[PDB]
Design a protein around this ligand. Structure first.
Ligand SMILES: Nc1nc2c(ncn2[C@@H]2O[C@H](COP(=O)(O)OP(=O)(O)NP(=O)(O)O)[C@@H](O)[C@H]2O)c(=O)[nH]1
Ligand SMILES: [Mg+2]
Ligand SMILES: [Mg+2]
Length: 252
């Protein structure tokens, strides 16, 4: 039995892909403690039973808005074996930005470049090899309209699910990397439920959850100015990496 979460920005085609895979074998309930819909389904492939969770659309994984809280809580605290980042092939920048945040969690991720049927009609050339090179994860082109890639995606899910390990290591510059190392050193004995680098990034960025959990673990307070400053530098470096991936992997 394989549990997979579909993550992605608003309106990139998560549910269409979900439907294409599960058909009528799905149901809707609520996430615990709130009224927001949880959508879940199952399909069988080569005898495997693959359980699918269709997450709320999210541009980022902060901890202020209910969609982001739910998505992130599931990604960090749930029982998904792997994650499919559903990306809009025509307008991929926001998707790839979100992807970088998830890769930093050190989870197994497959990139599904969906609506490939619409993308190919622009004349654009998407180089799957260059995406794999720069993102370090399996990439599959999919269409919920034509069915392109759906079987390849199923194959990649089971192929990836069998591995005993997944690193997206983005250099944030001397200052941030220095502070990350300090945080990592300080937390060295603590029992964390996520890798210390991700923890450090969120604590430095003043994330409502990680900043508060960090302070509880003994980490010093940071000024509002500092937290805002780290948050912006981290976001900027992610944007720059996305720009570079798009330049290397996309052509007119
Ligand atoms: N051409 C094409 N259109 C697609 C494809 N997948 C989704 N769409 C279209 O994209 C729109 C958004 O699809 P949807 O599955 O609802 O996206 P979502 O990511 O689940 N949205 P949300 O974040 O609100 O939950 C719909 O109009 C859908 O028909 C695809 O593979 N090809
Ligand atoms: Mg929508
Ligand atoms: Mg949806």
């Amino acid at each position: 039995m394989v549990k997979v979460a579909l993550a992605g920005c608003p309106n990139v085609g998560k549910t269409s892909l979900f439907n294409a895979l599960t058909g009528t074998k799905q149901y809707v309930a609520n996430w615990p403690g709130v009224t927001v819909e949880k959508k879940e389904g199952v399909f069988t492939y080569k005898g495997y039973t693959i359980n699918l969770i269709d997450l709320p659309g999210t541009y980022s994984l902060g901890y202020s808005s209910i969609d982001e809280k739910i998505a992130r809580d599931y990604l960090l605290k749930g029982d998904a074996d792997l994650v499919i980042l559903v990306a809009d092939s025509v307008n991929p920048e926001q998707s790839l930005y979100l992807l970088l945040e998830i890769l930093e969690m050190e989870k197994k991720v497959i990139l599904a470049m969906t609506a490939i049927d619409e993308a190919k009609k622009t004349g654009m050339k998407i180089d799957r090899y260059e995406l794999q090179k720069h993102l370090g994860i399996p990439v599959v082109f999919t269409s919920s309209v034509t069915g392109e890639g759906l079987e390849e995606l199923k194959e990649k899910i089971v192929e990836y699910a069998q591995k005993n390990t997944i690193r997206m290591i983005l250099d944030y510059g001397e200052k941030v990397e220095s502070e990350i190392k300090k945080v990592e050193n300080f937390l060295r004995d603590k029992k964390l439920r996520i890798n210390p680098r991700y923890f450090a990034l969120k604590y430095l960025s003043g994330d409502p959850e990680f900043y508060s959990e960090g302070v509880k673990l003994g980490l010093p307070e940071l000024s509002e100015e500092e937290r805002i400053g780290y948050r912006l530098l981290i976001a900027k470096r992610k944007r720059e990496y996305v720009e570079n991936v798009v330049k290397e992997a996309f052509a007119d």
